[PDB]
Amino acid sequence: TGLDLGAASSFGALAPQGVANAGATVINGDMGTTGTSITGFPPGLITGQLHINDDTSTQAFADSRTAFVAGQALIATVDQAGTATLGGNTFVAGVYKYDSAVGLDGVLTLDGAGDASSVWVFQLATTLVTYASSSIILTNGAKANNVFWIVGYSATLGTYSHLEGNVIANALIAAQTGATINGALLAGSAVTLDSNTVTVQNS
């Protein structure tokens, strides 16, 4: 019960209303927009293909929204209700449902429990915020590309934070200075970046 990102699966950063970057960002992956503005490359750099307003962009965007729809349609296996904090937890495979704003301060561990095909789907009804130097850790087989952050509004990643997983946001994804991602940023409005490293993971 992982999500298929389709043509989006090679993209480190994808958004309809553009990507804005500052600083020596490195995207180990493709980057695109169905709009026409990318700013800040250079000093940002990507290793893969740039797709600005072309067929790949259109298709990748649509698959990203498809994946988003699926991520929200899954039935939760853990209901976290109003819990506001992710940090300080170890979570095995699951569809975790949170009803409002969540933050990650400290360390969230994802425990593959011995099984590499472990899947996490975080259904975050509203915002995700991670804090400065917060981190997500993988253990016992957990793979980043089997982690899905389904963000009902927008995500903000804290300065020097580290995130594992595919971030699929309904609206904005803003990565603050020095945040690093093993995963992808698939936004419904814009992606903004500052001196980030985003490294697309496979399975």
Author numbering: 1 to 203
Task: Give sentences from the paper.
Here we present new structural data for an IBP identified from a cold-tolerant fungus, Antarctomyces psychrotrophicus (AnpIBP). The structure of AnpIBP consists of a 45-Å-long β-helical fold with a triangular cross section. The main constituents are 6-ladder β-helical loops, which are supported by a long α-helix located along the β-helical axis. The AnpIBP uniquely binds to the water molecules that participate in the primary and secondary prism planes, which were detected as a prism ring in the FIPA experiment.
We examined such water molecules located on the crystal structures of AnpIBP and the S153Y mutants. In crystals of AnpIBP and S153Y, the asymmetric unit contained six molecules and three molecules, respectively. Mutations in S153Y and T156Y on the B-face resulted in a decrease in activity to 17% of the wild-type. All AnpIBP mutants exhibited highly similar CD profiles to the wild-type, suggesting that defective mutations did not affect the overall structure but collapsed a structure needed for ice binding on the B-face. In contrast, the defective mutant S153Y generated a hexagonal bipyramid, as produced by fish IBPs. In FIPA analysis, the illumination of S153Y was observed in six patches at the middle latitude of the ice hemisphere. This result indicates that the S153Y mutant loses the binding affinity to the prism ring, as it occupies the equator. There are at least 13 polygons on the IBS of AnpIBP, which are mainly located around S153 and T156. Such ice-like polygonally arranged water molecules were not identified on the solvent-exposed IBS of a mutant, S153Y, whose TH activity and ice-binding ability were lowered. The illumination area of T156Y was further reduced in comparison with that of the S153Y mutant, suggesting a significant loss of binding ability. These results suggest that Ser153 and Thr156 on the B-face are the residues necessary to bind to the water molecules constructing the prism ring of a single ice crystal hemisphere.
